[PDB]
Write a protein that binds this ligand. Structure first.
Ligand SMILES: *[B]([O])([O])[C]([C][C]([C])[C])[N]C(=O)[C][N]C(=O)C1=[C]C(Cl)=[C][C]=C1Cl
Ligand SMILES: *[B]([O])([O])[C]([C][C]([C])[C])[N]C(=O)[C][N]C(=O)C1=[C]C(Cl)=[C][C]=C1Cl
Ligand SMILES: *[B]([O])([O])[C]([C][C]([C])[C])[N]C(=O)[C][N]C(=O)C1=[C]C(Cl)=[C][C]=C1Cl
Ligand SMILES: *[B]([O])([O])[C]([C][C]([C])[C])[N]C(=O)[C][N]C(=O)C1=[C]C(Cl)=[C][C]=C1Cl
Ligand SMILES: *[B]([O])([O])[C]([C][C]([C])[C])[N]C(=O)[C][N]C(=O)C1=[C]C(Cl)=[C][C]=C1Cl
Ligand SMILES: *[B]([O])([O])[C]([C][C]([C])[C])[N]C(=O)[C][N]C(=O)C1=[C]C(Cl)=[C][C]=C1Cl
Ligand SMILES: *[B]([O])([O])[C]([C][C]([C])[C])[N]C(=O)[C][N]C(=O)C1=[C]C(Cl)=[C][C]=C1Cl
Ligand SMILES: *[B]([O])([O])[C]([C][C]([C])[C])[N]C(=O)[C][N]C(=O)C1=[C]C(Cl)=[C][C]=C1Cl
Ligand SMILES: *[B]([O])([O])[C]([C][C]([C])[C])[N]C(=O)[C][N]C(=O)C1=[C]C(Cl)=[C][C]=C1Cl
Ligand SMILES: *[B]([O])([O])[C]([C][C]([C])[C])[N]C(=O)[C][N]C(=O)C1=[C]C(Cl)=[C][C]=C1Cl
Lengths: 179, 179, 179, 181, 179, 179, 179, 179, 179, 178
């Protein structure tokens, strides 16, 4: 809200992006646009992505994820408060070695959620889709954390809360940022 | 509504059951109860089940279906107006040779419909359930009509409307009742 | 509402059925049940069906129509107030020579109405269904009135209101009942 | 609501050939009134029927189901307005056997033109307009016959809501007598 | 609610009518019907009308009022609890000398209330109607109470609450019924 | 709905109880009352409990369950349509050897569901309660089916649908009732 | 949301258009206006259209589609997150050789959806319209992908989800943009 | 939405007006104001009116139509996406020879729609009004297309969809703008 | 909506006021303020008031009307689209000789509309008010048009639609502005 | 509301106003203001005024961990009410620089939440919120000097404290007199 530029525009000048909400299509379109703009300004300097998010749309999250992996600058990820669901997926997506959480930040991982209505045939199509989406997410999370796909699958069957230290041990982040 | 007994109680005295609504658990509980009662009164005399129904719950319909096949009396089925979805399934369930439709009655067959909300795992469970339910329905309908399961599957992919004459050719009924 | 039996049960004792509402599945189930009961009581005496109805479901109306043509007794139809849409179709369905309207009663004929929502394929299925239903209705109305199918089609494209005298000239009734 | 020795109060009065029209006139009300008229005639085709009318009006076609049944059956139907006969209620009041149409002294009668609605294409609005205008002509012609007023006077006097005292209703020809105590 | 007949049917056997609600068309229909029935049973014995009512429709109240004045039996009126607006008008309408209130019963008189919506011309018609209705009510109340029309007009401009004793002094009742 | 007694009262005369709805406190109150009454009429003759139910309240179901085990008569259970959740628990509760399902009836088992809201302390109390309730249900189901508690726990983690034949192999019923 | 110009206005300076929402008339009016403006600024430099969209109105999508094909500059299309329904149609509409998806982006194709209410005649008109619209879409998609119209028809009967790699095989895009 | 001026203000600098929504009084006020302003800036240079509109108010559309015919500059009309109802009327209103549609744009023509409530007299007034409005529209459309008034009347009785090529053959536009 | 100033502010620079909506208190306050401002800028140059309005509040309209008659500059009125009810009253209020309508613009005149709810006395007060307001409007309209008050009264009893040419012959405008 | 807006003008003097419930948007703004103030000057004190009924635990921890992360001392000043997570953040200011005005109110209590679904899911939610309560109690114990046992007992129900009681408790260091 405050003016200095608004406060977030002022931090964007220093290559800081604030992801502080649910991840929907509008949020992703803004974050992607900020990433593309920061890269056009300087393709060498690190970007800093702060993440306080309960999660959101899988496809919106993948728009952000693929943009992070596409652009030349390293994107550091810093979890403050909560990175849950697609929020923890994006936290794990930062440049390897530059993924952080503050000491009391919380990380939560779980499987995708959705809904389906209609004919048996359509419910089948929706089920196959969301199951294939879960496999895609598990494969990527396996690669970013070093855990096996089997372990990822087991650990996301239900809501799984992790402390910052547990998130580091898991491979979701690299360091807990001490004061 | 009118009194003679109410009009439907008066027809139940003559072993006539009127199924004239959507099939839910309360409707099934009444129809099943009327079938059990008619059998306890006389285990040999035919029962007459008039069907004007847009369909309804698969399990409620199977409560009626299995009761028809369980009891000793033959249950004749007479379609007036419309037998759609589970209504056409119950029409096909009458005693072989005693399944009828009036000349302008309409029959409609299609696949089950449902919904599923939650985790990928739960959507998978719901999808497998409704697909297995569709196979159960197709196998039984194949047995009652003489059509192959593959033909039943094709012919129910979308809403399939049949005239009374087409319903007889299909094997859903035995005779069109002429005036 | 009043008691004598309720007033309609008292008239049913004299083989009078009152159709005084929209035609839905519950109304059709009651009327069909009253017709079957009157026939079981006496298969030769006339039945009298008074019709004051704005219309309703096509399949519910056909449950009544096919029952009229099925049973042995003649069913006289008497229009009081309004027979519109499926109400005028059932008025035309009485025993030939025994279809009446009171002098200020109104008759209205028009084409079926419906709705369709979903994929192009499903909208196509619904369109073919309602068009085939319109052809079925026109063919029957042509046979009951003596008008050609082409004329019926033309005269039902929009709401077409007829006086009792016009309804007699049209062939929808046989006589205007004078005082 | 109350019960008499077993009858509800209206069923008890129907035994004496009294029908109570005490509500809006819709299809269910007309169905009941028509059924009571047919039943009273089947019981005795010669004795008068008494139709009390306290009604704000209602559906034109429902009212005509009642009107044509009154004119069809052999018994005379007396009409007695208590409280209000408005719109189709005043039309049915005027429909009683000539000489046997009454209102109590403080009863109110109101006459006006039909009301409706139309929605859709220009063509459909045209069809609905022609229908309701033809219905108004039908109502005016009948009311002209029942009251002795000209159709042009009926048309003028129903352009807007027109309230009449019982005495004015008698002078108009809508009733024959104000029933004094 | 209780059965002894329901409780009100049992009191109707003793020529007691209970007016214990808002006066609308259904209430008036019932009260008028009870009055006509009591007169047909015995045209010479008094009727007792208990009144606990907040008022209601003017025309519904006049259906009751004119029926009271029409029938041969005297109708005593007994106010218990409250007779307000059209309720106090009907209380004043009992047989002169036989209008009562219990000692703590409340009587309220005021002018008619209504609404009008539409063209200036229609609002004018509605205004003239309700003003003429107020004059009719004042003239009758003047003759039942002995007060002048001017005084009635002045005393009903706003809600005017009266004790039972004040109602007797006003002429609305004849006696306060002591224990 | 129909009268012969209503249809269910007529079957209660033959010691048949119809459980055809969701199990809440009113349903349990009625079923318990019917069981107590049937026992008071004859403490030696079998009772027949038909079950078509999606489930319901655990405590309402236990009111029925404990009443079944308390009374002297054997209670046969017959699944028609659907016995799900507490419905399948009550199906398994019939007299051993007298638990049935019709061939197309469906059985579903799963773990309890609930909600909790308030302070951490209150959420803890609610969690311990529902977990202890699940252990109680598993222990009883283990006794009634012969499966181990561990297997019951694994098989109820998610919605688990069983055919009638699968329900018999599981130990939930004793026989599939063939036609 | 952020200011640098808003972030999207800043990217429009570099000939980047962000389509990140459902496609309705307002979205199309903006995109068309941005295309016309970019062409007026420079008729030879490429335009970049990022697409993250669940789809939307067919006619709104065709306003965008025909504008792309009208203007002189090549329009590259880049799918991030999701291009579904009309979104995947516009993705396929980019300059041939310049249609991209990021590796985890999702593409979905299916047939048009709509609704129709009214007379049989009007439902027929609406059905013919949406079927002709589907043929128009299939013909164009056939041209843009190289698949036959029959294959397009078969592959869009139900929701058909494609990975980026599958979308390239299909001909909807030319390249998956690797990091 | 985007900034350069907003995108539409930037195109207005080049004498381009974007009509991309329903036509109501606010839309007409804006379009009329833009037309008057463009004429005041230069009374000779062409104006370009892009039309993507489902239609709207007849009087709002005539405010735009009469302003087009009043001002000195030619107004070219370009249909993108859909010009339906009053949208197709305004498309036909462009300077003769300068009325265009893009190849996949859709044109729809039909008769006016409205509603009327109240007294018979008021419904008559509303009916005469909308019928006279339809004649006014048909006369003008006849003049702009070269079709007879009777053909216009027949072709607008129901929703009539036209391709761009059909719209040119009809006389609603002069050219389909090829790429 | 568009910027050049917004489009309406740009036209206000040329002494053009756009009345393109319902007339309520906020609209009147703005129009009055624009009139006062234009007069303060130049007390001799004409003002141009475009009117496309369905009408609105009588007192809001009189705030505008009295301001027009108060200020020194002539106010030309130009009807585009529709001037109905208070909109046609303000159209008639322009400087005599400078009141215009475009050829297809519609003018409608009728009597005031309102509502009243409460005691008879209050309904009387409201009726007298709206009738006196109608007389005030008729007297002014009589002066502005040259028609007698009795003709104005007859011609406004119901909705009265006029073409531009009819409005000129009536005296509501002076000229139809041809192209 | 008034005009910089009034809060932007105070941010120029390193004053942050936390005057609402603490949700994710509020935390994102406060965190952003803290990061910005530190980037402007990593030495000068920041002043955080707190009038808040509380809010989300994780949103509050985003603010809390940012306070402890940055180099500048963050003074906390309670005006009106610091309740629940608001009182937790008040206790989080630089030791010696935690204040309340004399009539300000402080309230402490345990976390609140909800859980719907299977027994297994209710168990997961219960363990989560209980572990969150332990985390909050441990931190509050360190910031106040009270034992974890005492914190647990004093937060079982809503516990209202005057400013003076809050100082005695260790939630603040000083009551700011006029
Ligand atoms: B989460 O942030 O809650 C989660 C993300 C993954 C990492 C666990 N989000 C969802 O599950 C949201 N669901 C969807 O985007 C979705 C996906 C699919 Cl494939 C189908 C429907 C829905 Cl709604
Ligand atoms: B129909 O009558 O419309 C149809 C029955 C078969 C014969 C096509 N009804 C349904 O499919 C109703 N659906 C279910 O009973 C159902 C609902 C849900 Cl949420 C999940 C599974 C099932 Cl099987
Ligand atoms: B009418 O009573 O208004 C009319 C009947 C015919 C005689 C004109 N009723 C309907 O058209 C109601 N429509 C349907 O019952 C129907 C039929 C079909 Cl085939 C498809 C959809 C619907 Cl909704
Ligand atoms: B009144 O009883 O209120 C009146 C009857 C006549 C005597 C004035 N009722 C109506 O005008 C309404 N009744 C209709 O039957 C009607 C409704 C509609 Cl929407 C259209 C036409 C008709 Cl004719
Ligand atoms: B009272 O019961 O509250 C009162 C009657 C008094 C004056 C005796 N009732 C009403 O005023 C109720 N109003 C009407 O019945 C009415 C009358 C008229 Cl004339 C017009 C409209 C209405 Cl709504
Ligand atoms: B089922 O009938 O759907 C199921 C019981 C099965 C698992 C035997 N029902 C429920 O879980 C319904 N839940 C409760 O009655 C309940 C139980 C407890 Cl212990 C706490 C809360 C609730 Cl809401
Ligand atoms: B999609 O984006 O979901 C889809 C477009 C095609 C490419 C599959 N959208 C629609 O089908 C939306 N439907 C329409 O625009 C439409 C609606 C109606 Cl009622 C009638 C016709 C059409 Cl063409
Ligand atoms: B359309 O754009 O959907 C259509 C335009 C004509 C050219 C086919 N619009 C309408 O018909 C909207 N109707 C009106 O503006 C209108 C006109 C009249 Cl004269 C009376 C009522 C209404 Cl609502
Ligand atoms: B019209 O704009 O629809 C019309 C104005 C006259 C010229 C016909 N509007 C109204 O009548 C709106 N009504 C009022 O402003 C009004 C006036 C009075 Cl006196 C009392 C109540 C109301 Cl609501
Ligand atoms: B308070 O601000 O009201 C309180 C904070 C603590 C210090 C007492 N807030 C809450 O308890 C709000 N609850 C949550 O943030 C929460 C936490 C957990 Cl672990 C689970 C669910 C919820 Cl909703």
């Amino acid at each position: 809200i405050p003016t200095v530029y608004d406060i977030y525009s002022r931090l964007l000048k220093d290559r800081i992006i604030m992801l502080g909400s649910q991840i929907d299509d509008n949020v992703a379109n803004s974050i992607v646009s900020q990433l593309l703009f920061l890269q056009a300004q300087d393709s060498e300097k690190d970007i800093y992505l702060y993440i306080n998010s309960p999660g959101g749309s899988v496809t919106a999250g993948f728009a952000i994820y693929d943009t992070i992996q596409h652009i030349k600058p390293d994107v550091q990820t810093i979890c403050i408060g909560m990175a849950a669901s697609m929020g923890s997926f994006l936290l794990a997506a930062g440049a390897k070695g530059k993924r952080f959480a503050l000491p009391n930040a919380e990380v939560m991982i779980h499987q995708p959620l959705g809904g389906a209505q209609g004919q048996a045939t359509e419910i089948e199509i929706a089920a196959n889709h969301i199951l294939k989406t879960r496999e895609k997410l598990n494969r990527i999370l396996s690669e970013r954390t070093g855990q096996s796909i089997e372990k990822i699958q087991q650990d996301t069957d239900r809501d799984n809360f992790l402390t910052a230290a547990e998130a580091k041990e898991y491979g979701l982040i690299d360091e807990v940022m001490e004061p």
